Amino acid sequence: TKYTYPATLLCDFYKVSHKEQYPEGTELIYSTWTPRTSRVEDIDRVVAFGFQGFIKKYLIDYFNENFFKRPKQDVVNEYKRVIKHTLQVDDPDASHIESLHELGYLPIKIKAVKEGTFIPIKVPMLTIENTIPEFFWITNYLETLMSNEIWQPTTSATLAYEYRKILDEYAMETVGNKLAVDFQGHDFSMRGMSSLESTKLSGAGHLLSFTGTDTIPAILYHEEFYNANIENELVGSSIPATEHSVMCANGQDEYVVFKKLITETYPEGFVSIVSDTWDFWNVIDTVVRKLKGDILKRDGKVVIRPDSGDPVKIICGDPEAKDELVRKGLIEVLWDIFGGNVTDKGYKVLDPHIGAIYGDAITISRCKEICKKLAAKGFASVNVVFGIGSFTYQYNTRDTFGFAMKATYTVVNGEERQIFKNSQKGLVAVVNNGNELSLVDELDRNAYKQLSNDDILEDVFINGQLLRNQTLSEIRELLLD
């Protein structure tokens, strides 16, 4: 028997108790979603992403399938059972649940900026309110769930963009175009995300900035919620790649192993071969070097993947190593063997038959450092592909960018009031102010209606209706152009 988590209990327990605590005559509760701070250096804007997936998944699909379409008695019973046995209330009140189910839709209105927009720290990006006085309580009820579902997709998108930002600049600095950047950020993180759902949301954020990923469910997530179709557009893509357990199973005859892989198993196209199973630098000096003709013969690219050592020292060289190959580093050594071309900016790019990827403990600062030292050696940034892992995408909180749902506005017996402690007060809008986006708050309903044409927040969901349906392609256009 399939277990249904009631749509009316996807919250903190105390959310259930707030309805009775509001003042009598409360008709409206209005709350905003804001990144209040940044804990990541050089990042003062966040990449708005994730509202549509949450709205389609939970407010439309989940509530319709598991609440509104079901018998009224069943949703009432499921709510009463949990309240009765967890709050020790002998006879829980569910008349409001009855009334919501009889209404037949969620009486809320959600506005949000376009997904893909850069939002400065301390500028709200989404608002939610109730559209019928009787359900003043619904807004606050949903807050927990919304926060639970939308802070990770934005965080990942933002972090992903930072890599992208670095990689774009260096590309323009060292190549003069960014054509290779889409594949330079490669999601490796799925095994280290905390759940398949978190995997999907984080990986979708990654796919806003890059097309390279190993997180298959992220590609399909964009198919499910952002109208993507892999048959018509590059959502994500990846390459055949070996792994340490397979490398160890095949044995120590690394010449024959590599030769079989690149001449027989993958005679053409891309193939990534992890090379540090037994001795990395020996593999470069003795296997790859001996395979030069075969590598140059394939219509494709053999990508070398180290998976240990210091990323910067392995890629760019260790200046204090006695050994020449260790001193030079992978990119220079592969250049020495295979050569390549010179870009319009005077930088060296590897011959397209050989390549490099590094995906162990990659961080934003290490990506920046690798690009910087490579450029100092005359090598373009596009010579390395960065495997961006769970250290980047999992190791955050919702306070990494200071996100919070805050009630800022309420109507009680027709009286407008501002909600705060001691920050945003009253109704809010975000307007183009010169070349920046600016918060406007302390608005009453009249002033807010006046500003509506200038508010870059758009109606996204009212009363069960989806009002805006963005595509992955549209969001990528907004973000990167």
Residues 330, 304 contacting (CB under 8 angstroms): yes
Question: Which candidate, 275, 262, 270, 261, places its Cα nearest to that of 307?
Answer: 275
CA distance 201 to 224: 12
Name the DSSP class of 67: I
Q: Is residue 189 a contact residue for ligand NAD (CB under 6 A)?
A: yes
DSSP secondary structure string, 138-173?
HHHHHHHHHHHHHHHHHHHHHHHHHHHHHHHHHHHH
115/149 with CB nearer a copy of itself: 149
Of the residues 307, 332, 441, 455, which one makes contact with ligand NAD according to CB under 6 A: 307
Q: Which residues make beta-bridge pairs with 429?
A: 440
Of the residues 5, 278, 395, 420, which one makes contact with ligand NAD according to CB under 6 A: 395
CA distance 296 to 350: 12
CA distance 19 to 140: 9
Residues with Cβ within 8 Å of residue 387, at least 6 apart in sequence = 186, 187, 188, 357, 358, 359, 360, 362
For the CA atoms of the chain, what is the radius of gyration? 27
Question: Which of ligand NAD, a copy of itself, none has residue 179 at its interface (CB below 5 to 8 Å by kind)?
Answer: none
Q: How many CB atoms lie within 10 A of CB 352?
A: 12
Question: Which of ligand NAD, a copy of itself, none has residue 235 at its interface (CB below 5 to 8 Å by kind)?
Answer: a copy of itself
Residues 176, 347 contacting (CB under 8 angstroms): no
Question: Which of ligand NAD, a copy of itself, none has residue 453 at its interface (CB below 5 to 8 Å by kind)?
Answer: none
Q: Is residue 143 a contact residue for ligand NAD (CB under 6 A)?
A: no
Residue window 210-249: x/- pattern of binding to ligand NAD, with contact defined by CB under 6 A = ----x--------------------------x--------
Q: Is residue 26 a contact residue for a copy of itself (CB under 8 A)?
A: yes
Closest approach, Cβ 367 to a copy of itself, in A, equals 18
Closest approach, Cβ 404 to ligand NAD, in A, equals 8
Q: Is residue 39 a contact residue for ligand NAD (CB under 6 A)?
A: yes
Q: Is residue 191 a contact residue for ligand NAD (CB under 6 A)?
A: yes
CA distance 155 to 384: 24
Q: Is residue 397 a contact residue for ligand NAD (CB under 6 A)?
A: yes
Tokens at residue 108, please? 């809320």
239/475 with CB nearer a copy of itself: 239
Residue window 424-463: x/- pattern of binding to ligand NAD, with contact defined by CB under 6 A = ----------------------------------------
Binding residues for ligand NAD, per CB under 6 A? 12, 14, 39, 188-189, 191-192, 214, 241, 272, 305, 307, 359-362, 387, 389-391, 395, 397-400
